[PDB]
Structures are given as structure tokens and as C-alpha cells.
Amino acid sequence: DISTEKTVESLEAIRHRIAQIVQSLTHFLAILHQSESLSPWPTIHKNFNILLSQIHSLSNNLAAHSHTLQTTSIYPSLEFPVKEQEPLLTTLLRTKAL
Amino acid sequence: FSAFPPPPPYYKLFTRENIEKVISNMEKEEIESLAKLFKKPSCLTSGTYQMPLDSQDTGAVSASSVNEGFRADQKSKDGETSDLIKIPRRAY
Amino acid sequence: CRCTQLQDTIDEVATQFYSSIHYLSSHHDFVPLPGQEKVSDSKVNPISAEELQFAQRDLAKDLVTKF
Amino acid sequence: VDLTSIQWRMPEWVQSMGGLRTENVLEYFSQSPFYSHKSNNEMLKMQSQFNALDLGDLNSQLKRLTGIQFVIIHERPPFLWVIQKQNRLNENEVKPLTVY
Amino acid sequence: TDEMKSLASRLEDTTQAFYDLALIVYNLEDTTPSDAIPESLDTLIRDLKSLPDISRKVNNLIPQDVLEYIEQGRNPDVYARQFSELVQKDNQYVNGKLYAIEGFQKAFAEEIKQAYPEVSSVVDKILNEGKVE
Amino acid sequence: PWPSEDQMRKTLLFQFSTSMVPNLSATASQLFSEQTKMNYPASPTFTTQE
Amino acid sequence: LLSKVPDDKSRFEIELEFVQMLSNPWYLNFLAQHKYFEDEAFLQYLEYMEYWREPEYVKFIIYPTCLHMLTLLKNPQFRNDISRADLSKQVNDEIYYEW
Amino acid sequence: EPPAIPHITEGFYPLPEIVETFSHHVLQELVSLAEVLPSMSNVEKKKKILDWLLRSRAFTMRLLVLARWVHLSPSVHRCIDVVAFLQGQKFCFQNLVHVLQDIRYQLSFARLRNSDLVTALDILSTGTSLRLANAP
Amino acid sequence: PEYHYVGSVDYQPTRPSAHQNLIELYGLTELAKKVGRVDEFGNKRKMRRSYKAYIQDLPGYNEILRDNTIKQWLTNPIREEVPIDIEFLHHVFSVEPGIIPGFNPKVFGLE
């Protein structure tokens, strides 16, 4: 069970990172929508940069906990079975590439 | 979750560059000849049905209990006795 | 028009063949002999004896009308 | 053949047998590309020819046996079941190779 | 059955040889004569020799599912019950299926007869050809 | 109405494609997956066949 | 620039079947999602599919829809909207009703 | 005479084979335990002898149960054969239904329907005029 | 004047008939007497779900266990005989009277 809790803290860290990048992407979206004409290249470019910093941090986390993340496997059960009737699960846990 | 086969690789082959190379071929008149062989639509006449050329035959599937033919501008009807019928021959 | 519909009617006849036999096999058959009738009520799904006779008479009538 | 992206089922099989059961979940699994025919459960199925069996026998003989085995990890009768491709070299200790 | 009786006699002899030897070794004391515990082991092995010959004498056949039942501790008499019961059950079942088609045919023949009287002779010849001489 | 999905599975274009492609491809894998007598004693439970 | 590796007879069996695929709307939707309409080579190959309207050739085609589908796809805005799922369902439902 | 009927030969273990392999296995297990014993503690010698004695006695008992049930073997076997037959009659009914369905399928495969000339003429001009006009 | 395929083949009825009472026919009635739910007098027949009825005769407290080994002893039957050296086993089986921990004689069921 020690391996399980190590995987717990690991996936906690990746969760935090992905949270932050969602916030930065939503912010970008807002600035884009703010002006009817497309926004000035300096600002959008600046935002591409911050986006880069986020995704770089994420790739580092994933490679650092790469062993513990490829040993663990995810299946839904027990409490999801109340909502189990839905295909939302298949869409949420799908790993088909775009 | 659902998926279908991709089209032929030679779709990916097309370019307006190679097209222009084959119109240059036309202007002149290996690679170019292979391109035009690729561009022709050589239909086929006979012999292949799978993924027939004519409809299915009853003699081909099992034994056929009767045969008949009617002449041009004439039909056959005769009077034979089961319930003493006098009516058309195919229908009987 | 006419020819295709009649074609449909003979097809209808074949369908009636196996449909009929299957219906009859599906529904109650237990016959006691000497002994007492006894059933696996679940798998059996019985139908009334009178219901049986009436249903097979009906089936005969339907088939003969088709012909 | 990439096994992970794909989503499989045979409703024809299920209707042939009828309802979705514990044992029919393992048979259903046997029909799927996920199952491997070299499996230990397949070797057992080959050894008994048209006779009754029992499920406690099934797990207890799974451990008795050494190799690749497919067991039920969690079971929920109405809709969903959980299977894993665990490999035990020895009894009482298993290394799960895949989950399903 | 005289042979069956000799076999189950030797079997009971055997399970009692086991029991006796396990007792002898559980309750072991100096007073116990050493010649008495190898004697018991002797009786045991020679029992297990007798078992194959007598077995060869019997010659009945056991259904697999019986062996399974005994295996799981289930009562084999339950098997015998299920099968006699099933004989009766399937008996009635099939018989009545045949009757169901019987009536179906008779209905069909009468309906044909009123519908197509000209072939009544044919249909009667059809019922007569199914039966025995 | 239009080409049968399984006919699509069997079409010669796909078989040609997957000949040139490794069987490792991911959308072809989804399509790929989509594609007696006994003397023994009967079971002592009564069975109505279906 | 890999050397072409085609077969003569096989590619008219195949081009027939491909036209058929074009009859299916869901195949068009996937096709659009995969951004095959981004490639100009594809569109030239479509015009090559115009050879299948010819009488001796069309005599072979099984599902008529494709032909119509093909003329439908000549509008690019239509291509981006068959990327859309809603319109896809509209098209499928439209055939289903004609059928 | 009683009417001939198929006799069911597989699914059955001769009682003599059962007792033979049982005797031989129990004896092997004794020989096998007889070598591990001289290498074991006296308390462990005893513990293992005991365990074998009792396990083998449980097996012998299973065979005693068998021996007693034996006298019903021929009756039960007769049942089995009767059921076999009756099952076969049911299989007959079902099998017929499946053959009738199959030939009905071949039937739909054999009919031919009057041509849709309309669609054919539209496709002369390379469109399905129907599907376009109809559809918004 | 004759329709085709009609009466083309003659057949006698099936040899055993379902309509016959087969329990009598193949002499299973004595079995049914012996195993049925109902006695021939009308009283009910009690049948243990286990085979305790035969363990009841035998000495000792005997638990009912499930072990498929005899089946396996039938899948992999052994050769005709095993070697047996009485003297060696006599030697091996002389054991010192000392006690054995962790083992109760409940299995013996003497009392």
C-alpha cells in the first residue's frame, strides 16, 4: 500500500499543475474574446509564452513520476456505478489520440 | 470510438506539381508514363463480383420442377383435369 | 405491382410456417399420462388447454386463408 | 493491433446465453481479444468436458495453478464487472499485468 | 451386488484401518507394544492392495456429475432424484409437444378440406401414411 | 442505404491499406475488433431450448 | 516521394468502393474531422472520382447517394459543416426519411 | 422387447478405474512421505503422518459413499439414456424451425423486384435528384 | 393427376414414443419409488443435501470437505503399481511418544 500512497501524492502534484494550466488557458481565452478584432501580437505572444512554461512544468512532473504512473492503471467501480449507466465514463477515461 | 478505412495512398500522391509535370508531358507529345497510367480510368467488362455480372439462376441452386416458353404474340392455355380447369397454362 | 405483392404473399406463407410451429412448441404442452401433471412453471409458461385448441384452430384458419 | 483505444462487445453472444452473469462475464471475456487462449482459465476449460463445476473451486484452482490468469476484481451484478490479467508465479502472490 | 458388498466391506475396513493407526500414534506410550503399530500399518497397506482387485470385480459406471457431487460433499441420491424427476418431466413435455402438433395438423386438414374439398382423398391418404402397419 | 459497416471492414481498400500499414494502427484497430452432437449425459436440470 | 505502388484492376474495384464510402455521411464526418479536406491532393482525387459518373462506370456503382454527396462536397463551407456533428445527423436523417 | 435407444458411453468413469487410481495415489503419497520423514523432527514426523492419515481417510470415505450409491447406477444410467432420447426430440423441433427460417432467408434472396427506373434515370444524369430536392 | 413430392417417402413412427409412459417402459418406477419426493405410502422423503447419511455410520467427527483431486487423479492416472519396502516404512514410522502441539482430537470424536 506504500506504492499506492506514493502514487497518490504523485498524481496530486500533477493535478495541481494541470489545474493551473486550465486557469491560464481560460485567461487566454478571455483576453482573446475581449476585443472584437484580434488582439495585439505582443500580448498574445506573451500568453503563448506563459502557456509554454505551464506545459513544460507538466511534462517534467510526468517524466519524474513516469515509473509510478505507468505502473498504475485506472478502472471505475463501486461509487461510480450509480452513474455507471452513462457513456460519459468512456469519453472521460478514453485515451484515443486526437 | 467508431472508425472507417482511410482512402487510397495515391490520393496522398497527388500534387499540382506532378499534374504540371504531366501536362508538360502532354506538351512534349518513365515517371510521367506511370503518372498517366495512374490517371486513366480503365473500366472492366466482365468476370468479378465480390467486395455476379448477371442475375442468379434457379437451376444453379437446386432442381427445377418445370420449364416453359411462350411464342411471340401468342400464349398457351389448355384444359386438363384436376378440378376440371380450363385456364392459362403458366398460372395453372 | 401485382406480381411483387403476390411474391410478398408466398414469402408471408413461409414466415407463417415456421412462426406457427414455433408458437406451438413455445406454449404449454404438459400431458400427464397415468401420472400427475407437474411443471417447471418458470420455464414452462403454460397456456390453457382450451387456449391451445383455439390457438391452433386459429392458426390453421390463417394459413388456409393465406393459401 | 492496438488493444487499448478500442471498445468491444458481442451483444449477439450475450443474447445467445441470455443474461449477464459472473461466469458469463468470464466467458464473454473469453470471446474478447483481451483474453489470451494460452490462459490458465482456458487450460482448465479444456480439461473438463460438459460437467458441472463450482466457483469457489474456480478461484481455489486458479491459485493452485501457476501462470497467467483472469479473475474478477470487483463485481456489480446489475451492470458492470471488473477483470484483471494478473500473473501469479506462486500462490498467494500475484503481479497484475493488465486491468480490464 | 455380492461383489459390491465385498468392496464396500473392504472400504469400511480401510477407513477403520486409517482411524485405528491415527489413534495409535496420537496415544503413544511406552506400554504400547511396538509390534502393534507396524502391525496396524501392515493391515493398512494390505487393505489398499485388496482394493484394486475387488474394484476390478465390480464394473459399474459412475456418471461424472455424480463424482462431482461426491466431490463437493453433495448427496448422490440427489442426482438420482433429479434424473428420475427429469425423466418424468421431459416425458410429459415432449409427449404434449407431439400432441400440440397433432391437433395443429388435424385443424389444418379440416380447414383444407372445407376450403379445398377436391383433395380430401389426398389429405386422408396423408394421415394414413404416417402410421404403422 | 449506403455501404455496410462490415462491408467497409471487408472492403479491399481497407485490406490494401492495412497491408501497407502495420496492424498497430489505432482506428483500423477499432474496426478490426468490431469484426453440435453429444453423447454426454444431459444436465439434470430441466431445459426448454430457446 | 515514394514510388507509386498501385494495381490496375484493383484500383477500380477500390475506387468503386470509395465512391460508396462517400455515400455514407458519417464517413464524411470522420473524414472532415481528420482534416482530409485540408489537402488539395484529395480534391483533385475527388475530380478523379468524377470518372465514375460516366454511364459504363456508373452502371457499376451501387449506392446512388455518393454521386449527390460528391456534388454536395464541392462546396467547402459544406466540408467544414460536415465536420459538425449536428449537420451530420441532419444529413443521415434526411436520407433515412427519403428511405 | 424394450425399444432400442442410444446408449450413452462418455461422461462416465468406471468405478474400477476410480478405486484403482485412488489406491495407487494414496500409496504413492505414502512412499513420498516416507522419505521426507527421516529428515524431519520427531514431533514433525508425527504431525505429518497424522495429517496424511486423516486426509487419506477423508478420500476413502468419498469412495465409501460412492460404493453405497453404486446400486442405483444402472437405474440412473437408464434415465440418462432416456433423457438423451427426449432431448434429441426437442433438438428436432428447434432444428426444424431453424431450417425453415433459413429457407425463408434464401427466399428473400431469390425474389426479384421491379426496377426503380426513376432513380436509374436520375443517375443517368449523375445526381440523385430525389435526395437533393427533398432535403433542406 | 397427382401432386409432386406428396407421400414420396413412407416412414414408420419413431421407435420409442413420448406418448408412452417411459418411466414404466424402461423400469425406472422402482427407482422413483426409492428416490422420489413422495413415498409410495404418501409420506415425504427427506434427503440430506450433503452425504452425511453415510458419514453417520462411521466413527470419528468427520467434516465434509471439497477437493477435486480424485478428478485430477483420473485426468492423470498413474501406472500399474508403486514399489513398497515394508522394512523401511516400519523404521520410518517408529515415533517417540512426546506430545504434538496445536492439534486437537476433536477429529477423533471419541467423546
Side-chain angles (χ1 to χ4, degrees), chain A, chain B residues 1-52 59-60 63 69 72 79 88-92, chain C, chain D, chain E, chain F, chain G, chain H, chain I:
Chain A
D1 190 37
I2 292 189
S3 172
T4 314
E5 255 77 314
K6 187 185 177 187
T7 322
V8 165
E9 67 180 26
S10 150
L11 108 151
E12 206 297 309
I14 142 82
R15 173 203 127 241
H16 202 109
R17 282 310 317 169
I18 172 62
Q20 285 180 17
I21 155 180
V22 189
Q23 184 174 46
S24 56
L25 291 147
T26 55
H27 180 122
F28 186 50
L29 220 48
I31 300 192
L32 297 157
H33 274 316
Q34 165 191 344
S35 290
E36 291 201 3
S37 182
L38 48 61
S39 295
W41 195 28
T43 292
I44 151 198
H45 174 244
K46 174 177 183 172
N47 238 241
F48 269 116
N49 257 28
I50 152 77
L51 218 64
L52 159 46
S53 293
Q54 307 276 40
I55 193 156
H56 179 93
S57 161
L58 189 137
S59 179
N60 275 20
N61 287 113
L62 294 197
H65 322 76
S66 45
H67 180 61
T68 139
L69 284 188
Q70 53 213 156
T71 62
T72 182
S73 180
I74 290 190
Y75 60 86
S77 47
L78 327 109
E79 196 79 353
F80 179 75
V82 169
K83 179 61 172 181
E84 192 270 354
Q85 169 52 30
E86 276 64 26
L88 175 148
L89 201 290
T90 88
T91 322
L92 168 158
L93 211 143
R94 68 128 201 175
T95 75
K96 194 182 176 176
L98 232 34
Chain B
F1 38 87
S2 308
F4 333 113
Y10 34 103
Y11 121 82
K12 204 165 187 179
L13 156 146
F14 270 109
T15 61
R16 61 176 100 184
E17 153 49 50
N18 71 263
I19 293 162
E20 294 298 355
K21 190 176 170 188
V22 188
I23 140 93
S24 65
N25 181 112
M26 154 272 172
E27 147 70 358
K28 285 271 191 179
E29 310 189 11
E30 310 160 340
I31 324 173
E32 340 144 45
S33 305
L34 279 18
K36 77 178 183 183
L37 248 66
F38 176 84
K39 308 306 190 234
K40 276 194 164 178
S42 127
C43 135
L44 172 57
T45 64
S46 68
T48 95
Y49 195 66
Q50 205 34 241
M51 291 313 164
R89 201 165 161 189
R90 215 147 188 165
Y92 170 66
Chain C
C1 183
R2 358 121 205 223
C3 321
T4 139
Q5 171 185 34
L6 150 133
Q7 244 168 346
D8 284 345
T9 57
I10 66 209
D11 287 34
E12 226 171 13
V13 176
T15 293
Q16 187 142 338
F17 288 153
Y18 75 99
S19 78
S20 72
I21 307 186
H22 188 93
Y23 183 95
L24 286 149
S25 186
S26 317
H27 306 341
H28 185 260
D29 323 284
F30 278 64
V31 40
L33 309 9
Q36 282 211 18
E37 191 201 8
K38 192 182 187 173
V39 304
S40 208
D41 51 339
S42 63
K43 336 213 157 189
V44 166
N45 203 331
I47 85 157
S48 320
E50 173 169 276
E51 236 166 333
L52 192 167
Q53 172 193 337
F54 210 103
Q56 42 178 359
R57 156 192 153 165
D58 283 14
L59 204 7
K61 275 194 177 180
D62 188 307
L63 187 41
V64 82
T65 45
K66 274 298 166 195
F67 269 88
Chain D
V1 169
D2 176 270
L3 41 145
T4 173
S5 67
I6 58 98
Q7 82 93 25
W8 181 98
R9 35 97 205 89
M10 186 176 169
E12 184 167 16
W13 192 107
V14 162
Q15 180 60 292
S16 134
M17 192 279 181
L20 251 190
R21 289 305 181 188
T22 83
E23 262 306 330
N24 136 229
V25 134
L26 305 181
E27 257 72 308
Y28 206 0
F29 217 97
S30 168
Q31 262 59 2
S32 215
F34 295 174
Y35 191 104
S36 52
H37 290 333
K38 300 181 182 183
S39 166
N40 296 229
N41 308 357
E42 189 73 335
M43 166 268 164
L44 165 75
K45 243 174 179 177
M46 297 176 196
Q47 109 173 351
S48 80
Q49 41 190 235
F50 212 109
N51 9 242
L53 278 179
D54 32 322
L55 307 186
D57 174 298
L58 153 72
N59 37 318
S60 176
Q61 161 228 138
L62 267 21
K63 12 208 150 206
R64 166 189 213 173
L65 171 50
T66 69
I68 318 270
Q69 60 187 248
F70 298 94
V71 317
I72 281 194
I73 304 309
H74 292 65
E75 152 150 56
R76 178 135 182 172
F79 305 104
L80 96 157
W81 288 263
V82 186
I83 304 91
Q84 114 182 187
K85 181 169 188 171
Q86 63 180 25
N87 176 327
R88 103 202 302 144
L89 210 178
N90 74 324
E91 83 91 10
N92 199 18
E93 201 156 317
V94 212
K95 278 203 172 182
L97 301 209
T98 318
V99 167
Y100 292 92
Chain E
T1 266
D2 256 33
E3 299 67 21
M4 291 166 42
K5 287 173 179 165
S6 195
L7 182 146
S9 166
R10 195 56 125 212
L11 258 64
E12 75 186 14
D13 284 13
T14 274
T15 143
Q16 195 64 9
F18 275 171
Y19 193 96
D20 284 348
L21 183 84
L23 203 136
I24 290 188
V25 67
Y26 169 94
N27 325 255
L28 202 35
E29 286 168 345
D30 52 349
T31 74
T32 61
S34 54
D35 301 7
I37 146 197
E39 172 179 24
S40 164
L41 184 52
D42 284 10
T43 70
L44 220 187
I45 60 100
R46 87 207 212 192
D47 275 16
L48 275 17
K49 306 310 203 159
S50 61
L51 252 41
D53 294 15
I54 322 172
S55 188
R56 290 145 73 199
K57 276 168 187 175
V58 160
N59 200 238
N60 302 44
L61 293 250
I62 321 301
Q64 41 182 193
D65 310 58
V66 161
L67 195 46
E68 182 87 6
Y69 271 62
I70 317 254
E71 206 77 301
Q72 262 45 33
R74 216 173 163 160
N75 184 342
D77 300 6
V78 181
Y79 193 62
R81 189 198 230 96
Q82 299 166 256
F83 246 109
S84 70
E85 285 208 353
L86 193 145
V87 173
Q88 179 142 219
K89 199 171 236 169
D90 266 336
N91 191 162
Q92 311 204 32
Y93 191 63
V94 181
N95 177 12
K97 240 161 219 195
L98 294 171
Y99 278 143
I101 283 193
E102 267 257 48
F104 181 61
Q105 157 161 277
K106 307 180 179 196
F108 192 56
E110 293 184 357
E111 227 58 25
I112 282 174
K113 275 181 168 173
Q114 75 93 344
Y116 288 70
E118 49 278 3
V119 287
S120 181
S121 167
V122 193
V123 324
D124 301 324
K125 264 213 171 181
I126 291 179
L127 287 43
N128 293 1
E129 42 88 314
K131 305 182 177 182
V132 193
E133 264 213 356
Chain F
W2 63 54
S4 349
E5 140 65 4
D6 285 37
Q7 217 304 262
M8 234 162 318
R9 139 76 270 257
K10 314 149 197 170
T11 189
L12 276 34
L13 146 137
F14 180 84
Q15 184 165 292
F16 182 106
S17 170
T18 59
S19 178
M20 226 142 179
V21 180
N23 51 49
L24 293 69
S25 181
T27 244
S29 293
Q30 231 313 140
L31 162 164
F32 226 101
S33 169
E34 284 282 19
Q35 172 210 189
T36 43
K37 324 163 184 183
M38 68 317 285
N39 93 97
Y40 288 28
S43 289
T45 311
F46 164 85
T47 308
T48 290
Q49 305 199 190
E50 170 191 342
Chain G
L1 211 187
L2 169 58
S3 308
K4 54 201 101 176
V5 204
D7 174 13
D8 168 43
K9 164 181 201 164
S10 299
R11 68 162 227 186
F12 302 116
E13 307 175 90
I14 282 335
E15 283 179 31
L16 201 168
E17 257 309 328
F18 184 49
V19 177
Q20 263 49 211
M21 325 273 296
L22 272 44
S23 338
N24 183 310
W26 268 216
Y27 186 78
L28 299 181
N29 161 276
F30 142 90
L31 213 31
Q33 299 212 62
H34 275 44
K35 304 182 187 168
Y36 273 71
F37 300 101
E38 248 79 317
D39 173 22
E40 141 200 324
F42 204 172
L43 285 36
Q44 240 60 16
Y45 199 34
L46 152 199
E47 168 271 279
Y48 189 54
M49 256 29 190
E50 303 295 332
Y51 247 125
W52 267 235
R53 288 180 152 147
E54 219 47 28
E56 340 81 333
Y57 292 65
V58 74
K59 180 211 149 171
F60 232 123
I61 80 95
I62 277 153
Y63 304 98
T65 312
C66 54
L67 293 96
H68 173 259
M69 275 326 189
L70 163 48
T71 23
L72 251 65
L73 118 176
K74 249 143 175 182
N75 168 29
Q77 220 281 313
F78 167 80
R79 313 190 203 118
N80 198 27
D81 271 41
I82 69 187
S83 322
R84 271 179 173 170
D86 36 335
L87 170 142
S88 205
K89 185 210 163 194
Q90 272 193 349
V91 163
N92 169 41
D93 285 23
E94 282 182 324
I95 144 64
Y96 133 95
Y97 206 110
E98 137 65 355
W99 219 150
Chain H
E1 96 266 279
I5 212 221
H7 194 241
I8 276 189
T9 40
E10 285 156 326
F12 279 95
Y13 307 116
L15 208 232
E17 293 186 1
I18 288 187
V19 182
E20 198 173 348
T21 81
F22 155 100
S23 153
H24 285 25
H25 277 220
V26 161
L27 265 27
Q28 266 289 193
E29 292 193 358
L30 196 43
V31 164
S32 173
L33 254 70
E35 279 141 23
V36 174
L37 250 41
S39 246
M40 297 191 91
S41 10
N42 186 98
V43 37
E44 212 76 333
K45 277 189 197 183
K46 261 160 73 167
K47 188 163 180 182
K48 229 54 198 190
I49 290 181
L50 230 64
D51 174 76
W52 179 75
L53 254 11
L54 267 44
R55 203 181 72 107
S56 300
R57 197 174 159 281
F59 294 155
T60 47
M61 282 203 311
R62 302 170 178 287
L63 261 56
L64 194 68
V65 170
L66 205 65
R68 302 181 167 164
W69 178 92
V70 170
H71 69 77
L72 299 96
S73 74
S75 344
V76 177
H77 200 155
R78 258 175 278 146
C79 305
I80 291 184
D81 287 287
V82 171
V83 181
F85 173 72
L86 271 55
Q87 230 54 220
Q89 302 248 79
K90 307 152 138 187
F91 281 78
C92 260
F93 274 10
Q94 295 226 315
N95 189 11
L96 183 147
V97 213
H98 269 76
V99 191
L100 260 64
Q101 306 193 332
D102 198 322
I103 51 205
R104 197 267 130 76
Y105 183 96
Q106 310 192 347
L107 191 72
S108 184
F109 231 66
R111 86 121 52 90
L112 30 70
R113 47 290 292 190
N114 68 304
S115 326
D116 194 314
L117 282 348
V118 199
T119 56
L121 187 48
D122 297 11
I123 301 155
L124 137 125
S125 185
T126 72
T128 68
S129 164
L130 201 165
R131 275 216 213 182
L132 198 216
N134 223 340
Chain I
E2 183 161 27
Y3 306 100
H4 16 43
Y5 281 87
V6 64
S8 65
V9 293
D10 331 49
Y11 61 102
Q12 295 268 270
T14 45
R15 217 338 180 188
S17 159
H19 306 274
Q20 326 187 212
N21 171 291
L22 292 96
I23 320 119
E24 281 189 343
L25 210 177
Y26 297 84
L28 297 59
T29 59
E30 289 304 313
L31 179 57
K33 285 194 196 186
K34 238 182 195 181
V35 195
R37 313 213 144 209
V38 202
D39 213 354
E40 82 171 320
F41 285 49
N43 291 329
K44 295 190 176 179
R45 199 97 63 109
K46 296 183 158 186
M47 233 168 54
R48 300 265 156 179
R49 211 165 177 177
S50 73
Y51 56 65
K52 194 172 196 172
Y54 315 64
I55 85 108
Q56 120 185 334
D57 136 56
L58 295 174
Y61 172 111
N62 312 277
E63 271 203 24
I64 279 160
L65 53 171
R66 317 185 196 171
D67 157 287
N68 332 110
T69 52
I70 46 92
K71 305 192 234 163
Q72 205 184 5
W73 300 5
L74 275 36
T75 57
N76 285 304
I78 202 184
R79 1 120 209 160
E80 269 190 16
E81 242 171 354
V82 311
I84 183 53
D85 183 308
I86 266 195
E87 272 202 338
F88 177 89
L89 286 89
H90 283 203
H91 172 287
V92 168
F93 269 80
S94 299
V95 226
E96 271 178 42
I99 75 115
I100 12 76
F103 157 86
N104 64 343
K106 189 186 193 182
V107 169
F108 272 81
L110 208 174
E111 315 293 356

